[PDB]
Design a protein around this ligand. Sequence first.
Ligand SMILES: COc1ccc([C@@H]2CNC(=O)C2)cc1OC1CCCC1
Ligand SMILES: [As]
Ligand SMILES: [Mn+2]
Ligand SMILES: [Zn+2]
Length: 344
Amino acid sequence: SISRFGVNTENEDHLAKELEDLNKWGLNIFNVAGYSHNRPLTCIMYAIFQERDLLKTFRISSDTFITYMMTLEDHYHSDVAYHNSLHAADVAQSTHVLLSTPALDAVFTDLEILAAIFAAAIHDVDHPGVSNQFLINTNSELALMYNDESVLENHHLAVGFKLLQEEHCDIFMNLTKKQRQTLRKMVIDMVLATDMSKHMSLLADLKTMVETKKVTSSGVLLLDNYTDRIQVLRNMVHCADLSNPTKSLELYRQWTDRIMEEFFQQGDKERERGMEISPMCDKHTASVEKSQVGFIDYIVHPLWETWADLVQPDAQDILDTLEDNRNWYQSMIPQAPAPPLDEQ
Ligand SMILES: COc1ccc([C@@H]2CNC(=O)C2)cc1OC1CCCC1
Ligand SMILES: [As]
Ligand SMILES: [Mn+2]
Ligand SMILES: [Zn+2]
């Protein structure tokens, strides 16, 4: 319902144009935020759920869905540069596209689809804009409560599920106990897997799964066991979370400006509190370009190359864009006299 969004017909028309790319990697979530009074997570999630008929399938009224999403979105910190609702909306939409990749057609159940998109939406809720290590070093009550393990990730899950209890917010009210327990188990698994400290582990397990891929005649992956399905799902959400470098440079650059701004803000807090400044959190000694190239070579590319192998050739374009953006940042590093603007 558009009136909940407070959007007039003029901006609704603008939104309709942007949403033409709802099922595409090229969607511009920044534009979506701009035409939705900065409620991109709720807008894109409502769009996704309408698109996939999830509201009908799981009997979620639009009232309950929008009330919960608007409540959840409000728990993302708009003053945090990167980990705000715009990033969550981006991850949810990116996950929405990955679920529809050809190679995974008809592989997942509706509940698993609901679980992955929901996980993407709540995966960074109430993020304070500082790392787990910062919370641990300041003796944060949050770190004490979670025993320094996946502190924020555990917190994101607790908040996401806890908000279901506010007035008219239980979007899972009509799922059976069994369905809720299974969805909850999957969501917890997917959000916990977003902890970067688990990256190498997730990657190894993904590669070791691709080595024994069981594909059908049509080239459609075959995943009969739950264990394999949830491993593909946690890696999928993890890929969406690290999809910024795979988007058009216009979007990627905005994501880079934001993550750097957030790191610098943490660096400011560390300085303010008499703490040593963390790596890449000092604006005066930061190497944005170099950091992005390293980030891609050592983390993003290794991950996407493996995913693209699992769903080949679905992710070829994404792989090309990534490498294209990687080289752009490479030649952008101060002091690089090799076609300084787009390649080797
Ligand atoms: C656009 O870049 C980046 C985008 C996203 C992230 C993190 C991954 N998971 C998150 O939720 C935040 C790091 C980035 O860059 C790194 C390399 C240099 C700074 C940190
Ligand atoms: As909308
Ligand atoms: Mn995170
Ligand atoms: Zn995230």
